[PDB]
Curated annotation (Swiss-Prot):
The keyword Cell wall biogenesis/degradation does not apply. It comes from Homo sapiens. This is Transcription initiation factor TFIID subunit 1. Phosphorylated by casein kinase II in vitro. It is linked to Dystonia 3, torsion, X-linked: An X-linked dystonia-parkinsonism disorder. Dystonia is defined by the presence of sustained involuntary muscle contractions, often leading to abnormal postures. DYT3 is characterized by severe progressive torsion dystonia followed by parkinsonism. It has a well-defined pathology of extensive neuronal loss and mosaic gliosis in the striatum (caudate nucleus and putamen) which appears to resemble that in Huntington disease. Intellectual developmental disorder, X-linked, syndromic 33: A syndrome characterized by intellectual deficit, delayed psychomotor development, delayed speech and language, and characteristic facial features. Keywords: Acetylation, Acyltransferase, ATP-binding, Bromodomain, Cell cycle, Disease variant, DNA-binding, Dystonia, Host-virus interaction, Intellectual disability, Isopeptide bond, Kinase, Nucleotide-binding, Nucleus, Parkinsonism, Phosphoprotein, Repeat, Serine/threonine-protein kinase, Transcription, Transcription regulation, Transferase, Ubl conjugation. The lineage of its organism: Eukaryota, Metazoa, Chordata, Craniata, Vertebrata. Residues 1-371 are annotated as: Histone acetyltransferase (HAT). GO terms for cellular component: chromatin; MLL1 complex; nucleoplasm; nucleus; transcription factor TFIID complex; transcription regulator complex. The gene is TAF1. The keyword Metal-binding does not apply. GO terms for molecular function: ATP binding; histone acetyltransferase activity; histone H4K16ac reader activity; kinase activity; nuclear receptor binding; p53 binding; protein heterodimerization activity; protein kinase activity.
Length: 406
DNA sequence: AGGGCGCCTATAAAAGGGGGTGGGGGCGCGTTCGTCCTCAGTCGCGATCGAACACTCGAGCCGAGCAGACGTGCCTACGG
């Protein structure tokens, strides 16, 4: 059970962008430092980097007191955008080995760490302890390969994906800088996980699929309801211009569709007119709005449009998505293939063009039929096992390489 | 107790059975070989079932056009 932060659950901006142009899609999950137009750090010259130690201790203390003040047990702390800052709480880094994994979290979403352990035969004294995560004793593997007896494997686990992770040490040279309009802050950060290839648990839709079109529609609908809720006017009213600015690729006519059932156009002598909430229309509750569209569904959709943009950039037209190698790497194909195989509907290529590492240390998620048929499945498991073990060994290794001069 | 007289030894030849010994043939029984049958396995042929592909129909979405309303500008008429 995953409980996301309130800003994420509410699909607030900027945590959940309403629109992304080509540039943003290319930079998806890699935001570049952009200059500020105003505020302290818009100014030239040196700027102080501030310590956070007193602040970190204080927030931990305040949070624990709030915990004891009601009057123990479990509390949920991620209620406001302010609670999501890197400025307090314990922090880890996670570095993703896939250049563009099929699903990624937005800021404000939650994930668990699970410590998968397989018992040694006979008298097992229990799993080793880890600094992070909750131990899970598993007789069957949640991955493509099987755990060996006595093997502990850490992993990220959420509704988008499961992925093995490997704990490493941050280099002694490195610090985390947090940057706001107001100043820089610095934190020590020692724990950094390498993330291995994802096992997708959520299916990414194809471009212009019914699923995709239903999603943008519903997301637009949610944004609209939230606009009415934000309005302080009675009767509530919103401006077309504000919707168009958030959804610049929607025609005014398609926006009028979403508005015709809940609101009335009020014309004024000025090129700004209002849509006023109908007096017999009951605005959906917070709880009902949340049920309309989940953060996971937004993540699936984002994955599609970003991939679609990268494909266009590489010369692959919409008619391409009998199929080109590059199109096989698309998240709508890889997630579909992996999930089908998880349900026993087919097997996976494993060795193939969709291996995200390009060098045999990752899996190619491409459907092959279940179609000597005990040898067919034993060969699939053997190959899965080999790559599974290879990935764990390479990504957990502390060996120092050796810059490639090419 | 001893002399003579009986028998043995050797020679030829015939008569005919009968008896004895050895070899061959015939007859009967058993063994071996061949043929047939049965069983099992494999291959081929035919029929039936399942899967895949194609075609048709319906629904939805998008776009374009028209109408209405509002605002602004220009011209004409009315009022002071």
């Amino acid at each position: 059970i995953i409980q996301h932060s309130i800003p994420a659950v509410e699909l607030r901006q900027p945590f959940f962008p309403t629109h992304m142009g080509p540039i943003k899609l290319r930079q998806f999950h890699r935001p570049p430092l952009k200059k500020y137009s105003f505020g302290a750090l818009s100014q030239p010259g040196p700027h102080s980097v501030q310590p956070l130690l007193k602040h970190i201790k204080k927030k931990a203390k305040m949070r624990e007191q709030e915990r004891q003040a009601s009057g123990g047990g479990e509390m949920f702390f991620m209620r406001t955008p302010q609670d999501l800052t890197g400025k307090d709480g314990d922090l880890i880094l996670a570095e993703y080995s896939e250049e563009n994994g099929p699903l990624m979290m937005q800021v404000g979403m939650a994930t668990k760490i699970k410590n998968y352990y397989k018992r040694k035969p006979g008298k097992d004294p229990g799993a080793p302890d880890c600094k992070y995560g909750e131990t899970v004793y598993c007789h069957t593997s949640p991955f493509l390969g099987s755990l060996h007896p006595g093997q502990l494997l850490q992993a990220f686990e959420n509704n988008l994906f499961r992925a093995p992770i490997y704990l490493h040490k941050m280099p002694e040279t490195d610090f985390l800088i947090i940057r706001t309009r107001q100043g820089y802050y610095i934190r020590e950060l020692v724990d950094i996980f390498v993330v291995g290839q994802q096992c997708p648990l959520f299916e990414v839709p194809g471009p212009n699929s019914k699923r995709a079109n239903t999603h943008i529609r519903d997301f637009l609908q949610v944004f609209i309801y939230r606009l009415f809720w934000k309005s302080k006017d009675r009767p509530r009213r919103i401006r077309m211009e504000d919707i168009k600015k958030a959804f610049p690729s929607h025609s005014e006519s398609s926006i009028r569709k979403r508005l015709k059932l809940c609101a009335d156009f009020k014309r004024t002598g000025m090129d700004s007119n209002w849509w006023v909430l109908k007096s017999d229309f009951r605005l959906p509750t917070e709880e009902e709005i949340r049920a309309m569209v989940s953060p996971e569904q937004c993540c699936a959709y984002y994955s599609m449009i970003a991939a679609e943009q990268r494909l266009k950039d590489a010369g692959y037209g919409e008619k391409s998505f009998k199929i080109d190698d590059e199109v096989r790497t698309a998240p709508w194909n890889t997630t579909r293939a992996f999930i089908a195989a998880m349900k026993g509907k087919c097997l996976l290529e494993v060795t193939g063009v969709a291996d995200p590492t390009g060098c045999g240390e990752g899996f190619s998620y491409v459907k092959i039929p279940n179609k000597s048929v005990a040898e067919h499945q034993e060969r699939y498991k053997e190959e899965c096992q080999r790559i599974f073990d290879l990935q764990n060994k390479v990504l957990s290794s502390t060996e120092v390489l050796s810059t490639d001069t090419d």
